[PDB]
Structure formats: C-alpha cells, structure tokens
Write an enzyme that holds these catalytic residues in place. Structure first.
Site, PDB file in Angstrom:
ATOM      1  N   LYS A 138       0.805  -1.210   0.000  1.00 33.47           N
ATOM      2  CA  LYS A 138       0.000   0.000   0.000  1.00 33.47           C
ATOM      3  C   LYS A 138       0.849   1.276   0.000  1.00 33.47           C
ATOM      4  O   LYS A 138       0.394   2.325  -0.451  1.00 33.47           O
ATOM      5  CB  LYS A 138      -0.945   0.001   1.199  1.00 33.47           C
ATOM      6  CG  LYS A 138      -2.087   0.990   1.073  1.00 33.47           C
ATOM      7  CD  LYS A 138      -3.090   0.804   2.203  1.00 33.47           C
ATOM      8  CE  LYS A 138      -4.337   1.630   1.963  1.00 33.47           C
ATOM      9  NZ  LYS A 138      -4.021   3.060   1.719  1.00 33.47           N
TER      10      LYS A 138
ATOM     11  N   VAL B  47      -1.201   1.586  -5.469  1.00 35.02           N
ATOM     12  CA  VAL B  47      -1.734   0.501  -4.654  1.00 35.02           C
ATOM     13  C   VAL B  47      -2.561   1.116  -3.526  1.00 35.02           C
ATOM     14  O   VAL B  47      -2.037   1.898  -2.729  1.00 35.02           O
ATOM     15  CB  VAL B  47      -0.602  -0.360  -4.068  1.00 35.02           C
ATOM     16  CG1 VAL B  47      -1.144  -1.475  -3.205  1.00 35.02           C
ATOM     17  CG2 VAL B  47       0.263  -0.936  -5.176  1.00 35.02           C
TER      18      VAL B  47
ATOM     19  N   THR C 245     -11.902 -11.561 -27.273  1.00 32.77           N
ATOM     20  CA  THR C 245     -11.115 -10.320 -27.402  1.00 32.77           C
ATOM     21  C   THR C 245      -9.685 -10.573 -27.866  1.00 32.77           C
ATOM     22  O   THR C 245      -9.028  -9.645 -28.351  1.00 32.77           O
ATOM     23  CB  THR C 245     -11.073  -9.463 -26.117  1.00 32.77           C
ATOM     24  OG1 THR C 245     -10.326 -10.135 -25.103  1.00 32.77           O
ATOM     25  CG2 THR C 245     -12.454  -9.186 -25.610  1.00 32.77           C
TER      26      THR C 245
ATOM     27  N   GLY D 252       6.048  -9.207 -29.984  1.00 37.52           N
ATOM     28  CA  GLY D 252       4.673  -9.542 -30.326  1.00 37.52           C
ATOM     29  C   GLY D 252       4.378  -9.232 -31.780  1.00 37.52           C
ATOM     30  O   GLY D 252       3.661  -9.967 -32.447  1.00 37.52           O
ATOM     31  N   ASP D 253       4.926  -8.131 -32.272  1.00 39.39           N
ATOM     32  CA  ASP D 253       4.734  -7.736 -33.666  1.00 39.39           C
ATOM     33  C   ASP D 253       5.844  -6.786 -34.111  1.00 39.39           C
ATOM     34  O   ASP D 253       6.770  -6.508 -33.341  1.00 39.39           O
ATOM     35  CB  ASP D 253       3.348  -7.106 -33.840  1.00 39.39           C
ATOM     36  CG  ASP D 253       3.258  -5.702 -33.278  1.00 39.39           C
ATOM     37  OD1 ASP D 253       4.211  -5.223 -32.648  1.00 39.39           O
ATOM     38  OD2 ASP D 253       2.218  -5.048 -33.489  1.00 39.39           O
TER      39      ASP D 253
ATOM     40  N   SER E 184       8.976  -3.236 -28.839  1.00 38.26           N
ATOM     41  CA  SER E 184       9.811  -4.066 -27.975  1.00 38.26           C
ATOM     42  C   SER E 184      11.170  -4.408 -28.611  1.00 38.26           C
ATOM     43  O   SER E 184      12.157  -4.601 -27.895  1.00 38.26           O
ATOM     44  CB  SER E 184       9.055  -5.339 -27.594  1.00 38.26           C
ATOM     45  OG  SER E 184       8.823  -6.170 -28.727  1.00 38.26           O
TER      46      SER E 184
ATOM     47  N   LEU F  43       3.177   1.889  -1.988  1.00 34.55           N
ATOM     48  CA  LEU F  43       3.540   2.215  -3.364  1.00 34.55           C
ATOM     49  C   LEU F  43       2.424   3.039  -4.011  1.00 34.55           C
ATOM     50  O   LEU F  43       1.242   2.822  -3.705  1.00 34.55           O
ATOM     51  CB  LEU F  43       3.808   0.935  -4.177  1.00 34.55           C
ATOM     52  CG  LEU F  43       4.882  -0.013  -3.618  1.00 34.55           C
ATOM     53  CD1 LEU F  43       4.900  -1.337  -4.384  1.00 34.55           C
ATOM     54  CD2 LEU F  43       6.256   0.646  -3.635  1.00 34.55           C
TER      55      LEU F  43
ATOM     56  N   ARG G  93       4.973 -15.318 -30.545  1.00 33.65           N
ATOM     57  CA  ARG G  93       5.910 -14.210 -30.504  1.00 33.65           C
ATOM     58  C   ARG G  93       6.928 -14.394 -31.620  1.00 33.65           C
ATOM     59  O   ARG G  93       7.032 -15.471 -32.216  1.00 33.65           O
ATOM     60  CB  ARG G  93       6.572 -14.103 -29.134  1.00 33.65           C
ATOM     61  CG  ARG G  93       5.606 -13.606 -28.070  1.00 33.65           C
ATOM     62  CD  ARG G  93       6.289 -13.299 -26.750  1.00 33.65           C
ATOM     63  NE  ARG G  93       7.029 -12.037 -26.784  1.00 33.65           N
ATOM     64  CZ  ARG G  93       6.499 -10.825 -26.648  1.00 33.65           C
ATOM     65  NH1 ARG G  93       5.188 -10.661 -26.481  1.00 33.65           N
ATOM     66  NH2 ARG G  93       7.288  -9.758 -26.683  1.00 33.65           N
TER      67      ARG G  93
ATOM     68  N   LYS H  89      -6.269  -7.667  -1.541  1.00 36.51           N
ATOM     69  CA  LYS H  89      -6.061  -8.790  -2.450  1.00 36.51           C
ATOM     70  C   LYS H  89      -4.663  -9.395  -2.304  1.00 36.51           C
ATOM     71  O   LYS H  89      -4.509 -10.617  -2.344  1.00 36.51           O
ATOM     72  CB  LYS H  89      -6.347  -8.365  -3.881  1.00 36.51           C
ATOM     73  CG  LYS H  89      -7.813  -8.070  -4.119  1.00 36.51           C
ATOM     74  CD  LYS H  89      -8.051  -7.564  -5.538  1.00 36.51           C
ATOM     75  CE  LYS H  89      -9.519  -7.649  -5.922  1.00 36.51           C
ATOM     76  NZ  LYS H  89     -10.383  -6.764  -5.096  1.00 36.51           N
TER      77      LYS H  89
HETATM   78 MG   LIG Z   1       5.008  -4.210 -30.896  1.00 34.21          MG
HETATM   79 MG   LIG Z   2       2.330  -3.088 -32.958  1.00 35.62          MG
HETATM   80 NA    NA Z   3      -9.092  -8.149 -30.041  1.00 30.93          NA
HETATM   81 NA    NA Z   4      -0.515   3.657  -2.208  1.00 27.27          NA
END
Ligand SMILES: [Mg+2]
Ligand SMILES: [Mg+2]
Ligand code: NA
Ligand code: NA
Ligand SMILES: Nc1ccn([C@H]2C[C@H](O)[C@@H](COP(=O)(O)OP(=O)(O)OP(=O)(O)O)O2)c(=O)n1
Ligand SMILES: [Cl-]
Ligand SMILES: [Cl-]
Ligand SMILES: [Cl-]
Ligand SMILES: [Cl-]
Ligand SMILES: [Mg+2]
Ligand code: NA
Ligand code: NA
Ligand code: NA
Ligand code: NA
Length: 326
Positions: free
Chosen positions: A51, A56, A92, A180-181, A171, A53, A140, A63
């Site tokens: 907490k 948070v 998604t 990823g791409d 990245s 930080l 990847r 949790k």
């Molecule tokens: Mg990318």
């Molecule tokens: Mg991209």
């Molecule tokens: Na999507």
């Molecule tokens: Na905090």
DNA sequence: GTCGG
DNA sequence: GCTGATGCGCC
DNA sequence: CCGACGGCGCATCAGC
C-alpha cells in the site's frame, strides 16, 4: 518473477476489468499497480507494505494479503469458473474483436473459434483476418526473425526513396529477445509539421512491400498509419513462417523524437511518463511536448533535439529503451 | 481502483 | 457531407 | 451521481 505471483494476479484482474466489465479505468489502475510492484526491488510480505507504493490502495492491498496467505484469489477463482466471462475474454484475443463485439457475439451463442469460423458472415474484414491468423498472431517473433524482417523493410523502403528513414520500434528497439509484432516508424523530408510536399508517402512504401509479397493483408490504412499482416519467405520442404502483425506510422520529420519516444513504449511506460508530464505542467503526445496554460490548454510545442530533452522537461532521469520495459 | 483538488 | 461518439487498435 | 485518469489514428454510426 520476484513478486511474480502478485503481478500475474493483478494483470489477470486488469484483463477481466477491460474485457468483461468494460471498466477501462480499473484496467488502468490494475496495470499501474502491477507495474509499480514489478519494479519494487524487495519481496512483498504484506498488503500494508504494498500500500505504500503509488497506485496501490486499500482494495489491492487486501487482495495482496489474501494471495500471500493462500497462494490464490477467490475473486479470480470465480471469474475462471464463469463460462461466459471466459468466452468473452477469449474472443477479445481475436484482432478486431474488442470487449463490445465479444459481449455481443457471446450474447448470441458465439463462444469458440469453431463458432466464429461457422459465422464468418457476422465478421468484418479485420475480424476475418484476425480469425484466419489467430494461431499465428498468438506466437511471438524471435529477435532473429525480427532482424530478417527489418532487413526486408529497410531494403524495400530504400528502393522507393533513399531519403526515407525507417526505424523499427516497439519491444524490438527496447532490446527484447522476442516481440509480439513489428512496429516501423517512417519519416521522409517531404512530410513535416510545416508541409506535405509529396502525396501518398506512406502508400508508396506499403505498395512496394505488397509488390514483393512481404505485406499480405491490410487491416486499416490512412495517410499516416498502416496496420496489416506480413510474412517472411521460407524455403522448400520447410514449415512456413507464421504470418505476423505489422504497424507502420509516418511521423513528421521535425517531430521524430516525440514519435520514436511514443513508438518505443512500453505502453505503461508511456502512460506513466505522460502522467508525470501532467503533474509537471506539460502534455506529451507522439508529435509534441507542450506546456499547459491556466485554461488547461496546451501552448506551443517546445524545442526537442533528443529523446532525453523530453525527459529533461519533466525532470526524469533518462531511461535507455531497454529500461522502458515493464 | 486510486488519488488528489 | 458535417460534428461528435463509439469501437477497433498502437505505444 | 467527486472527477481525472495518456493520447491519438482509422472505421463506422447517430443525428443532423
Ligand atoms: Mg510491438
Ligand atoms: Mg504493434
Ligand atoms: Na481483439
Ligand atoms: Na498507495
Ligand atoms: N475525497 C472526497 C470525498 C468525497 N467527495 C465528494 C462527495 C460529495 O459529493 C461531496 C461532499 O460529501 P460529504 O458530505 O461526504 O463531505 P463532507 O466533508 O461534508 O463530509 P463530513 O461530514 O464527513 O465532513 O464531496 C470529494 O469530492 N472528495
Ligand atoms: Cl472504469
Ligand atoms: Cl474491417
Ligand atoms: Cl520531436
Ligand atoms: Cl500536437
Ligand atoms: Mg503491444
Ligand atoms: Na539489411
Ligand atoms: Na481502409
Ligand atoms: Na500461406
Ligand atoms: Na539533454
């Protein structure tokens, strides 16, 4: 994996909030907590410690206390046992199906890849492409393959006009061992904040990359942004390379540093950097850094000659691209 | 969900 | 068509 | 229904 349990839990809650609850700000709150926890250099031993930080609060700390005591979270147990939530979250993952379309599809009994394949007429072009390459887009890209891809892109761009400069960002630029791409930042001296002295500057590049069969499909395309699919060539008898996502962004040549800062990311680094700019009295986008006035209105763009200059304006120690990852 | 005006 | 909102996506 | 929260490109739809 220091505090890996906790950051995995928070990330799973973020994705639930975005994809199922359609609560984008809770998604962002969980992403920020996960980010600040992942950079914390100690093993978290209580919610109270957490907490302290920024990002948070009471609920995340509760949790963390549950997870630390039990190795699980009951809230996530329930979510994972909910077929509807799981199906919405899953849909998604298809490119072009967001939280709204996923909920609509699931409300109509479309809950699996097979269901989507049987109901292709319900999908737009983007979604059809996302479905066609679903497996491939889950994979990847090894940095070795990103290097071959970089080689093709830079070669073909050079062929169109040697004054183009193409820079692989995302990245890859952050030094990642896999990506990823592919994200390509493009500049040309004819396109600046002052003038568009040539038409179809992005189109010419996309067209050449299609001519040589590197780009295979188009998801969306305007004057400054291309979003599509590409593939490395592979040899006889050998397994094909997976199809890959590619993003190309044409940025005004005089706004290159704001552009490359934006396109290098990471996403959370960018949001956190932009948040700090706001508390420092500035606003940052991929084009400019501007001071904020009394009306909250952004003033004129400030001079920038490097990525570091942007950091300087907001009094952040400079971070190399590799230290901008989560 | 968290933070701050 | 327009403006503005929503839905997709990017870092 | 405290409200901001990072910021924007492309595609599409609502109400003109
Ligand atoms: Mg990318
Ligand atoms: Mg991209
Ligand atoms: Na999507
Ligand atoms: Na905090
Ligand atoms: N940190 C907070 C907490 C609440 N509110 C909102 C909620 C209400 O719409 C309004 C005033 O609510 P209260 O009557 O709860 O605030 P008081 O200060 O009057 O409460 P108390 O009687 O506890 O002093 O402010 C706010 O802006 N910022
Ligand atoms: Cl929200
Ligand atoms: Cl489409
Ligand atoms: Cl710049
Ligand atoms: Cl701008
Ligand atoms: Mg990404
Ligand atoms: Na090369
Ligand atoms: Na199009
Ligand atoms: Na093929
Ligand atoms: Na400097």
């Amino acid at each position: 994996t220091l505090n890996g349990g906790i950051t995995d839990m928070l990330t799973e809650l973020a994705n639930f909030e975005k994809n199922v609850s359609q609560a984008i700000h809770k998604y962002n709150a969980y992403r920020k907590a996960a980010s600040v926890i992942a950079k914390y250099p100690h093993k978290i031993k209580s919610g109270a410690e957490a907490k302290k930080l920024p990002g948070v609060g009471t609920k995340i700390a509760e949790k963390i206390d549950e997870f630390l005591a039990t190795g699980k979270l009951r809230k996530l147990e329930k979510i994972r046992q909910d077929d509807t939530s799981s199906s919405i979250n899953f849909l998604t993952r298809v490119s072009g199906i967001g939280p709204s379309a996923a909920r609509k599809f699931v409300d109509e009994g479309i809950k699996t890849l097979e269901d989507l394949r049987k109901n292709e007429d319900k999908l737009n072009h983007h979604q059809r492409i996302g479905l066609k390459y679903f497996g491939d887009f889950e994979k990847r890209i090894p940095r070795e393959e990103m290097l071959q891809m970089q080689d093709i892109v830079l070669n073909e761009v050079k062929k169109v006009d040697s004054e183009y400069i193409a820079t692989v960002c995302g990245s890859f630029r952050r030094g990642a061992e896999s990506s990823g791409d592919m994200d390509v930042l493009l500049t040309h001296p004819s396109f600046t904040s002052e003038s568009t002295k040539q038409p179809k500057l992005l189109h010419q590049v996309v067209e050449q990359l299609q001519k040589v069969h590197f780009i295979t499909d188009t998801l969306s395309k305007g004057e400054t942004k291309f979003m599509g699919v590409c593939q490395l060539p592979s040899k006889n008898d050998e397994k094909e390379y997976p199809h890959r996502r590619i993003d190309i962004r044409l940025i005004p040549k005089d706004q290159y540093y704001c552009g490359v800062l934006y396109f290098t990311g990471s996403d959370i680094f960018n949001k956190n950097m932009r948040a700090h700019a706001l508390e420092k009295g500035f606003t940052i986008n991929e084009y400019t850094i501007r001071p904020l006035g009394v009306t909250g209105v952004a003033g004129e763009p400030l001079p920038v000659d490097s990525e570091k200059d942007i950091f300087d304006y907001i009094q952040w120690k400079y971070r190399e691209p590799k230290d901008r990852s989560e």
